[PDB]
């Protein structure tokens, strides 16, 4: 009927969810976010794309080449991603008087589940609700990532992916995210002199090569890290909320409100 935990226990719980999230996340490390929009916002504008217009008139005076705008105006609804857990009042009493850890294992478990869920969302949108998957986004620039288990392996595929991106006039500092099998099987120590394959790939990429288990067995993607190609609109970060006492046991729920809008669906390549 009241707010059970005090300031110190609130702080411990919140820092636990914060730390577990900041450790577990790979999506926040590759995309930049539209400013925290507040709770009230529930829809955002969309993208702009395939506006193939040379626009290279370059005269004295000016001609009338067309302007760039959203290809077709529309909106999307920011989902809500949550996990739930429970606490027992006698345990709060004990933590208050007898022994004083206040076990918060459940918060850690909930935060891990929520973060895993949202990464699966970012790399694979929900089919039923209807969103975009980074391995299923339309206009995806396929390139065979096969023929590994060779001395010169993944380098020959990353270079091909980069030329494919760059012929689309879409370049910059690139980023790579790889499945666990491929990423760990990449330490074929030698290219020729002394350099690990991962680190020379990184020199070619210049924005990190990450591993995320959420990917399938034999797959990975490479993107152009800039904004104005991809985005991550947030309405609030992962936080903890109280669901009101029920049968004297206290429930709780961890929240996060996210959506990615791939503005320019040209910076994507796959297997």
């Amino acid at each position: 009927a009241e707010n059970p935990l005090r300031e110190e226990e609130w702080a411990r719980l919140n820092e636990t969810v914060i730390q577990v999230a900041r450790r577990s996340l790979v999506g926040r490390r590759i995309l930049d976010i539209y400013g925290p929009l507040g709770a009230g916002v529930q829809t955002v504008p969309y993208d702009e794309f395939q506006g193939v217009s040379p626009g290279a008139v370059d005269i004295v005076g000016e001609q009338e080449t067309a302007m760039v705008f959203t290809d077709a105006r529309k909106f999307k609804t920011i989902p809500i991603i949550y996990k739930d857990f429970l606490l027992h009042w006698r345990d709060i009493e004990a933590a208050r008087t007898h022994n004083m850890p206040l076990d918060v294992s459940a918060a850690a478990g909930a935060a891990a589940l929520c973060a895993q869920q949202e990464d699966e969302l970012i790399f694979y949108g929900d089919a039923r609700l209807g969103y975009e998957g980074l391995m299923t986004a339309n206009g995806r620039l396929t390139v065979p990532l096969g023929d590994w288990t060779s001395p010169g392996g993944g380098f020959q595929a990353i270079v091909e992916a980069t030329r494919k991106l760059n012929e689309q006039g879409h370049f910059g500092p690139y980023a790579v995210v790889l499945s666990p099998r491929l990423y760990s099987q990449l330490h074929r120590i030698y290219e020729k002199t002394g350099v690990l394959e991962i680190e020379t790939i990184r020199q070619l990429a210049s924005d990190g090569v990450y591993q995320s288990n959420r990917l399938r067995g034999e797959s990975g993607v490479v993107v152009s890290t800039g904004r104005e190609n991809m985005d991550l609109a947030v309405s609030m970060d992962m936080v903890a909320a109280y669901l009101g006492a029920s049968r004297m046991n206290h429930p709780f729920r961890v929240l996060e409100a996210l959506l990615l809008r791939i503005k320019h669906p040209d910076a994507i390549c796959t297997l």
């Binding site: 996340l25 926040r28 490390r29 930049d32 976010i33 925290p36 929009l37 924005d207």
Partner: peptide
């Protein structure tokens, strides 16, 4: 008045 942000300060 400001809408705080906690976890997502990861670069790029």
């Amino acid at each position: 008045p400001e809408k705080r942000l906690t976890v997502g300060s990861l670069r790029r």
